[PDB]
Symmetry: C3
Subunit: 134 residues, 3 copies
């Protein structure tokens, strides 16, 4: 049937700040295009090597979003006001969505903690597994 495994990956994104959730370019799954219109998707946003730069306990919020908006989110933050070096802080987020609710796409998004610039310069992925009771 429909291939039940969906995936998108990137190796970089332009460095930005944001006060709201904004798409991480390339982390996008087109569910409607796949003909998936019911059942559930287990979605994993994997950003294994991010870093944040800023002047006030930097960090990044990440979200899984659909056309209906944010379904789940989280963040990492450093434990010092201005880290001596902004270390790489692995981040994974997992959510399960009902496609029947009207889901046509899934995206990874990010937002600044305290004005931080947001850095991806290596592999990151957005994955989904489709399940049905049919």
């Amino acid at each position: 049937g429909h291939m039940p495994l969906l995936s998108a990956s990137i190796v970089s994104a332009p460095v930005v700040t944001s006060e709201t959730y904004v798409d991480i370019p390339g982390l996008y799954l087109d569910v409607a295009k796949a003909g998936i219109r019911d059942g559930k998707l287990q979605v994993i946003l994997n950003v294994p090597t991010p870093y944040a730069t800023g002047n006030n306990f930097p960090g990044i919020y990440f979200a899984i979003a659909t056309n209906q908006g944010v379904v789940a989110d989280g963040c990492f933050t450093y434990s010092s006001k201005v880290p001596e070096s902004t270390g790489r802080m692995p981040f994974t987020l997992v959510a399960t969505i009902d496609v029947g609710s009207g889901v046509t796409f899934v995206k990874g998004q990010w937002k600044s903690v305290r004005g931080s610039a947001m850095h991806i310069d290596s592999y990151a992925s957005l994955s989904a597994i489709w399940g049905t009771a049919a």
Copy 2:
């Protein structure tokens, strides 16, 4: 057949300490209620934004448990005795269990590192995918 994707999520838990693994309230999957009695479950415990508070290199242990007890565990810990700010330390744990062994539920659990108080104040999830050779 049985919907092969199971999930539970929370956005907070009462702040506690524990010297043993104790349930994270709400992170519970009822496998027996779903009629799943054989095959395997790939379980993901996702706690993307925890923090620990304490006086001695704080942290949190997390576990995946069934009615048979802990199947897998791990922790995060800070790298300073008393962090200047207790940053958010994303945590994910993945284990695969044989349901045929007698599994009726799956839970997320947590335990203090060195007496730490344990904090969830945003999204966290427990997910499972059922697979069968049938």
Copy 3:
């Protein structure tokens, strides 16, 4: 059919350094032995409790590799030159591979950041879910 859930887990590995990706002993899935020769695998490398020791902002790179080499990688790093204590830095990596390309096994691998010694002394896992459009 073929059990669509594959998993391997360990609780320790000999402490090593490496300037290249080297196998994490025991984190190995034999895909060919399972008779899986097409479709896709969603692979998760879960190293929830590693630490790195070294003198120069320590860390560990991790990779998912097949017989064809590295498909995805990432790292954690500390935010201090010589951490007061090398805290536990949870790490997860997720990649989806096309088995049809000629994949016969999947492995977790690791490599030093800046000469770090690499430590696993508790649970770690390598998991895969097989999906087919057939």
